[PDB]
Amino acid sequence: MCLKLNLLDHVFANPFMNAAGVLCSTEEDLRCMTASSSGALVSKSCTSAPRDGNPEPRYMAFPLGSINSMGLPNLGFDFYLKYASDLHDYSKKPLFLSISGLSVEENVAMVRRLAPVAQEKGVLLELNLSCPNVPGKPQVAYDFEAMRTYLQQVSLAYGLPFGVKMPPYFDIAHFDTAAAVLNEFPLVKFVTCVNSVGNGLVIDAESESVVIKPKQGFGGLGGKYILPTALANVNAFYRRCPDKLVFGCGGVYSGEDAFLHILAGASMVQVGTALQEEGPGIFTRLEDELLEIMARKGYRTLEEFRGRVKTIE
Amino acid sequence: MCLKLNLLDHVFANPFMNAAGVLCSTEEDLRCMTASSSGALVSKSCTSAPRDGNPEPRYMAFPLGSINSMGLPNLGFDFYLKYASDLHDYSKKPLFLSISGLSVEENVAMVRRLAPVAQEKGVLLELNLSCPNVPGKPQVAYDFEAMRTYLQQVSLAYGLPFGVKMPPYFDIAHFDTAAAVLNEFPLVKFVTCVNSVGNGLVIDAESESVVIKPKQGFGGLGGKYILPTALANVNAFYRRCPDKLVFGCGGVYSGEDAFLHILAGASMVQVGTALQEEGPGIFTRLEDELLEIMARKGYRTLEEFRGRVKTIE
Numbered sequence: 001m002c003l004k005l006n007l008l009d010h011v012f013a014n015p016f017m018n019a020a021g022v023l024c025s026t027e028e029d030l031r032c033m034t035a036s037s038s039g040a041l042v043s044k045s046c047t048s049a050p051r052d053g054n055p056e057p058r059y060m061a062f063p064l065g066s067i068n069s070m071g072l073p074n075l076g077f078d079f080y081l082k083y084a085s086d087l088h089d090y091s092k093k094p095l096f097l098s099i100s101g102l103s104v105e106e107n108v109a110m111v112r113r114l115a116p117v118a119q120e121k122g123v124l125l126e127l128n129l130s131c132p133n134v135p136g137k138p139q140v141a142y143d144f145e146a147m148r149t150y151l152q153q154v155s156l157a158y159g160l161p162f163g164v165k166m167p168p169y170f171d172i173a174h175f176d177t178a179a180a181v182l183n184e185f186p187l188v189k190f191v192t193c194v195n196s197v198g199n200g201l202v203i204d205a206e207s208e209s210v211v212i213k214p215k216q217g218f219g220g221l222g223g224k225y226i227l228p229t230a231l232a233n234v235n236a237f238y239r240r241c242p243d244k245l246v247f248g249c250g251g252v253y254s255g256e257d258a259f260l261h262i263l264a265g266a267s268m269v270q271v272g273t274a275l276q277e278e279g280p281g282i283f284t285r286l287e288d289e290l291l292e293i294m295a296r297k298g299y300r301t302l303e304e305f306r307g308r309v310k311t312i313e
Numbered sequence: 314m315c316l317k318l319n320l321l322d323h324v325f326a327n328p329f330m331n332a333a334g335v336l337c338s339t340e341e342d343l344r345c346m347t348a349s350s351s352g353a354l355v356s357k358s359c360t361s362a363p364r365d366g367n368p369e370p371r372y373m374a375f376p377l378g379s380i381n382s383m384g385l386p387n388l389g390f391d392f393y394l395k396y397a398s399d400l401h402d403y404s405k406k407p408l409f410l411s412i413s414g415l416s417v418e419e420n421v422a423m424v425r426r427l428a429p430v431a432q433e434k435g436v437l438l439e440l441n442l443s444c445p446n447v448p449g450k451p452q453v454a455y456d457f458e459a460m461r462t463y464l465q466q467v468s469l470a471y472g473l474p475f476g477v478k479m480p481p482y483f484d485i486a487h488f489d490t491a492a493a494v495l496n497e498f499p500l501v502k503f504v505t506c507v508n509s510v511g512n513g514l515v516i517d518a519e520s521e522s523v524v525i526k527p528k529q530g531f532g533g534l535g536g537k538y539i540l541p542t543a544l545a546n547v548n549a550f551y552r553r554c555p556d557k558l559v560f561g562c563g564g565v566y567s568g569e570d571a572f573l574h575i576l577a578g579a580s581m582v583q584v585g586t587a588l589q590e591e592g593p594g595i596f597t598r599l600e601d602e603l604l605e606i607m608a609r610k611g612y613r614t615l616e617e618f619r620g621r622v623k624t625i626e
């Protein structure tokens with residue numbers, strides 16, 4: 001028994017991959033993720049030019065999860081495109097490239113350049129719709145008209161299947177509106193639910209201080225804190241987008257957590273905080289644990305249980 | 314060293330109280346909360362007419378928190394008004410009455426009625442804005458136009474200081490907008506942050522099933538899952554509403570968690586999931602734990618550290 005699957009016209013050894021932003025950023029990180037047992041890897045979300053990011057400390061982790069205000073530190077789009085085009089060994093596993101321009105024009109400029117590398121090499125685009133915006137305006141995924149603009153412009157500029165990285169939603173009418181936007185776009189083939197839960201605040205009692213420097217300590221939450229949020233979003237999109245795949249991300253520390261994501265509807269399962277904390281060895285543990293639970297249940301394939309979470313009466 | 318507070322023209326032995334919905338719904342519950350060591354109590358959010366609420370099971374708890382889709386089961390306004398007017402012993406502690414009408418007209422009808430009892434007996438109103446409006450629209454506090462409407466009508470109808478119970482927000486633009494709406498209403502003297510984190514989904518791995526019956530398993534989250542969200546919201550409103558009090562609610566299981574709330578800016582601290590799980594003996598434990606932290610740090614009163622939290626740089 002093995003966990004191999006086929007999606008998006010690619011073959012994957014297993015459904016696991018890093019979450020964007022974790023273990024990705026440099027050529028070394030990417031080489032490390034490729035060497036791991038993961039089924040796939042995604043690069044750090046990038047901007048057209050390189051970015052330092054926000055001041056440090058900007059990440060901290062704790063038993064229940066993590067908080068970050070990284071600020072999109074990245075090597076710039078030319079580096080990630082070069083990685084995709086010249087450096088990555090596609091024979092090892094698929095590559096996704098995450099783009100997170102600060103405007104629609106920036107995203108369009110990057111995707112036009114990605115397109116021929118996607119066609120030639122099969123790199124897959126994940127468009128990050130979870131960046132914050134400037135005072136007086138919510139992030140793009142929380143502004144449905146802007147989101148529709150982004151997706152119209154990218155779909156036209158790119159012209160090939162792609163996916164979108166979504167922030168969590170908390171209200172059923174928002175699930176209905178956001179899924180309806182997404183379903184206007186046939187090139188949107190996967191939806192990754194979820195990004196970090198926005199603008200949490202971790203305080204240390206002993207020091208009486210926030211734990212990260214940027215934004216007066218406010219930053220995105222990941223890890224155990226966010227597992228039921230992540231599962232809700234996975235399942236809500238899985239129900240509303242029958243012609244798309246849903247990729248689960250949030251709160252995965254074990255094969256049991258991966259199992260729950262898949263029961264909710266996840267095709268691939270991304271690991272952020274736990275991978276940052278445990279390192280890439282985690283992927284062999286997750287595979288083993290997921291196969292153990294499958295064996296105890298009598299499941300031979302992921303398809304047997306994906307999306308088959310039971311409701312009560 | 315002491316936990317005593319004096320706010321809203323009342324005196325409180327300590328900052329702790331139940332969160333609305335927990336251990337409030339019946340006369341029995343209200344007498345129990347009154348007999349406890351809490352500094353205050355709040356009654357179950359009510360509607361004009363009694364409600365049975367949603368089908369069971371509709372609450373479940375786990376090590377990291379709870380999920381609920383109670384559906385506003387309550388004995389109706391007239392009961393809670395009677396409790397406030399005839400049964401509550403104000404010599405023991407102050408009472409808050411929470412309302413959660415299904416429309417702006419329902420809320421106005423109740424606050425019109427409540428006003429003379431508020432004036433005579435000193436019951437305090439908490440208006441629940443994290444509550445349903447028209448189905449297929451977001452809850453009231455995620456629809457800033459509806460939220461302004463509700464506060465305008467209630468302010469006119471009631472004419473006395475009140476407070477509001479808010480859902481959590483996740484986007485700085487939402488903090489800015491929501492706070493600005495609140496600051497339009499001088500009668501809004503306290504803001505309680507936060508209600509449950511909406512539409513989470515808990516899945517049991519062994520049974521492969523959601524754990525509550527309503528809404529295909531989706532419900533609001535409380536407990537350890539939500540503490541950094543709660544803190545962020547307390548602090549965000551504390552900073553943006555300098556002429557209001559902020560009450561904190563979310564993730565309180567210990568005096569340390571309460572301390573963090575208070576450092577974020579909280580003036581009362583409400584206890585939901587942990588109280589549901591441990592019972593009213595929690596209040597003596599939280600009091601002792603909070604006093605211990607104060608003793609170790611040399612703080613003699615709550616005002617010495619309320620809203621202090623340090624930022625980096």
Ligand SMILES: Cc1cc2nc3c(=O)[nH]c(=O)nc-3n(C[C@H](O)[C@H](O)[C@H](O)COP(=O)(O)O)c2cc1C
Binds near residue numbers: 044066128222
């Ligand atoms: C340090 C760090 C950096 C991240 N950077 C990005 C990013 O560049 N792009 C992105 O889509 N998400 C980014 N995220 C979000 C993660 O991809 C993931 O959505 C979130 O951490 C929740 O998953 P988890 O519970 O496994 O951590 C980042 C998360 C962390 C912790």
Ligand SMILES: Cc1cc2nc3c(=O)[nH]c(=O)nc-3n(C[C@H](O)[C@H](O)[C@H](O)COP(=O)(O)O)c2cc1C
Binds near residue numbers: 332539564584
């Ligand atoms: C069983 C249950 C019932 C609740 N009912 C209400 C309610 O009637 N009105 C309200 O404002 N909040 C209600 N809430 C939300 C709690 O007041 C509180 O905001 C939330 O549970 C977060 O606090 P916690 O982390 O201490 O549980 C309810 C919560 C629970 C668990």
Ligand SMILES: COc1ccc2cc(CCc3c(C(=O)O)[nH]c(=O)[nH]c3=O)c(OC)cc2c1
Binds near residue numbers: 070072130132
């Ligand atoms: C406060 O200064 C900033 C500046 C840029 C930001 C960019 C993003 C998008 C990248 C990203 C980041 C990040 O690089 O901080 N962290 C996440 O948890 N998810 C993300 O998707 C972002 O995502 C939540 C937050 C950012 C915050």
Ligand SMILES: COc1ccc2cc(CCc3c(C(=O)O)[nH]c(=O)[nH]c3=O)c(OC)cc2c1
Binds near residue numbers: 382509533
């Ligand atoms: C039929 O589905 C319903 C019906 C009524 C609802 C009423 C509320 C408001 C009361 C409330 C409830 C509740 O009574 O269900 N639970 C919470 O965690 N916070 C609350 O404020 C509510 O709060 C989210 C959710 C409700 C869901």
